[PDB]
Amino acid sequence: IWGASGKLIDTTA
Numbered sequence: 302i303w304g305a306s307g308k309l310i311d312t313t314a
Contacts, residue, residue, distance in 0.1 A: 305311045 302310055302312050302314055
Protein backbone atom coordinates (compact mmCIF):
# COMPACT_ATOMS: atom_id res chain seq x y z
CA ILE A 302 0.00 0.00 0.00
CA TRP A 303 1.64 3.34 -1.14
CA GLY A 304 -0.64 6.46 -0.92
CA ALA A 305 -4.19 5.03 -1.44
CA SER A 306 -5.15 1.54 -2.84
CA GLY A 307 -8.92 1.86 -3.67
CA LYS A 308 -10.57 4.12 -1.00
CA LEU A 309 -10.54 2.95 2.75
CA ILE A 310 -6.88 1.56 2.95
CA ASP A 311 -4.69 4.77 2.93
CA THR A 312 -1.27 3.93 4.60
CA THR A 313 2.41 4.24 3.33
CA ALA A 314 3.62 0.63 4.10
